[PDB]
Amino acid sequence: PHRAELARQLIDARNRTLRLVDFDDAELRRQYDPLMSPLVWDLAHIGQQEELWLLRGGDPRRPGLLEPAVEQLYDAFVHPRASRVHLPLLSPAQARRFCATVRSAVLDALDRLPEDADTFAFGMVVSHEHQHDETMLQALNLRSGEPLLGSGTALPPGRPGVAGTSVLVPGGPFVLGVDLADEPYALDNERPAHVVDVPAFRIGRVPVTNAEWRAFIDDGGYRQRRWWSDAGWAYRCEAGLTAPQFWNPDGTRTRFGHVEDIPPDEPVQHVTYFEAEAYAAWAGARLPTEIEWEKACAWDPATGRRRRYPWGDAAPTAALANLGGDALRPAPVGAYPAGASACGAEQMLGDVWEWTSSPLRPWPGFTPMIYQRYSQPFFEGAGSGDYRVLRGGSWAVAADILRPSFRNWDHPIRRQIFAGVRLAWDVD
Numbered sequence: 001p002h003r004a005e006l007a008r009q010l011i012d013a014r015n016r017t018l019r020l021v022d023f024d025d026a027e028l029r030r031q032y033d034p035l036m037s038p039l040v041w042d043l044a045h046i047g048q049q050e051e052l053w054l055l056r057g058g059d060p061r062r063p064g065l066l067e068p069a070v071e072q073l074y075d076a077f078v079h080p081r082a083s084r085v086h087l088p089l090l091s092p093a094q095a096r097r098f099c100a101t102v103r104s105a106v107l108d109a110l111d112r113l114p115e116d117a118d119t120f121a122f123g124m125v126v127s128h129e130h131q132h133d134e135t136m137l138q139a140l141n142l143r144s145g146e147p148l149l150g151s152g153t154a155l156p157p158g159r160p161g162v163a164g165t166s167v168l169v170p171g172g173p174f175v176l177g178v179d180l181a182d183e184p185y186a187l188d189n190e191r192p193a194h195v196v197d198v199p200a201f202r203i204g205r206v207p208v209t210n211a212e213w214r215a216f217i218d219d220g221g222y223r224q225r226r227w228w229s230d231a232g233w234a235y236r237c238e239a240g241l242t243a244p245q246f247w248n249p250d251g252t253r254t255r256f257g258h259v260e261d262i263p264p265d266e267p268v269q270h271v272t273y274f275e276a277e278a279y280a281a282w283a284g285a286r287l288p289t290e291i292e293w294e295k296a297c298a299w300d301p302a303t304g305r306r307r308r309y310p311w312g313d314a315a316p317t318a319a320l321a322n323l324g325g326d327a328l329r330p331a332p333v334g335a336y337p338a339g340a341s342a343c344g345a346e347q348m349l350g351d352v353w354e355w356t357s358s359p360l361r362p363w364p365g366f367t368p369m370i371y372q373r374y375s376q377p378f379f380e381g382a383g384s385g386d387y388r389v390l391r392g393g394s395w396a397v398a399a400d401i402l403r404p405s406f407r408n409w410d411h412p413i414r415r416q417i418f419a420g421v422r423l424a425w426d427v428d
């Protein structure tokens with residue numbers, strides 16, 4: 001954009017990062033849960049990736065500030081999450097110094113870029129840092145003990161008449177994905193724009209709520225194998241799943257260390273893919289495919305056009321969606337009527353990541369971005385395991401990095417992520 005706007009975005013991302021590591025060194029070195037890196041790992045990894053993609057042209061053979069063996073401590077493919085707490089990592093002071101040195105050089109580089117030069121990598125790195133900010137939030141939510149963060153900023157109230165209900169998405173061709181011409185910082189797996197024929201289906205007007213999930217629990221949903229897939233039931237049994245994560249026996253939940261009543265009308269959060277598909281079956285529905293999801297989000301059947309956001313082309317605001325990290329929770333269903341898609345689906349962007357039944361697959365014409373290992377290793381059959389795509393962003397996602405076409409994914413056994421469920425149905 002303006003180089004000034006990119007600088008602004010990089011600086012906002014780093015402000016966020018530095019708030020999330022504004023704790024004692026011992027906190028930053030802790031393993032809150034074996035699923036998660038220590039925060040000091042994400043801190044240095046953020047700087048190392050910024051250096052690699054913006055100062056070293058993505059070529060690790062070009063010299064960096066760190067010895068290559070030190071740099072490789074921050075290679076996510078080499079070091080499984082659980083092992084990272086024991087690695088000989090840079091201290092918090094070293095990591096902050098490294099990040100600052102890199103950032104100074106990056107801002108100078110941005111200044112010096114020729115007019116009309118390609119800036120894709122800068123936007124890619126903004127996305128990378130904000131994504132790690134959400135990862136660090138996941139870790140802080142898992143942390144046992146008295147809260148470090150506050151309990152979250154105010155959200156609007158919900159409204160009656162939306163929970164449980166569905167909207168029709170009329171059948172036919174629509175444009176899936178985007179081109180760089182339209183979204184200059186769309187990540188590689190979002191591209192290119194192409195047509196897919198999607199038969200008529202219905203999708204939930206809002207996500208599944210906590211009170212709805214409690215009904216599933218109360219009817220014995222976790223005790224009845226018929227709602228679950230073979231793999232899902234086996235995992236439910238292995239892991240002893242009986243409720244969403246952080247729901248306590250006494251009916252409270254623990255959210256960033258805060259013990260509180262579970263609000264009935266918020267989207268359910270911290271459920272596995274396997275839980276999501278079991279609830280959907282028990283409810284008489286199914287999960288959407290990600291293609292269904294994106295059509296419901298972005299397509300306007302009255303005009304036969306894609307919208308930039310579900311509501312139109314206006315930049316996200318606090319009146320339109322719950323984004324950016326400050327709320328530390330999703331909003332009550334019905335809280336954002338102005339954020340509805342053309343078909344009437346609300347809270348598609350923000351609040352909770354929504355499970356879909358789609359594995360990650362390339363769109364026809366896919367070509368990798370400079371960070372070649374960002375998507376490709378996770379495509380179905382690429383040999384990295386089983387993944388399902390999540391859509392729409394959560395309350396923790398920065399508005400700057402989110403689009404209807406954005407594709408998250410994870411193993412179906414993961415629920416420390418800020419994920420919930422929106423139902424779908426076939427139409428006859």
Ligand SMILES: [Ca+2]
Nearest residue numbers: 348350352392
């Ligand atoms: Ca969402």
Ligand SMILES: [Cl-]
Nearest residue numbers: 037045076135
């Ligand atoms: Cl990671």
Ligand SMILES: [Fe+3]
Nearest residue numbers: 045049128132
């Ligand atoms: Fe990363």
Ligand SMILES: [Mg+2]
Nearest residue numbers: 215218219220
């Ligand atoms: Mg009953």
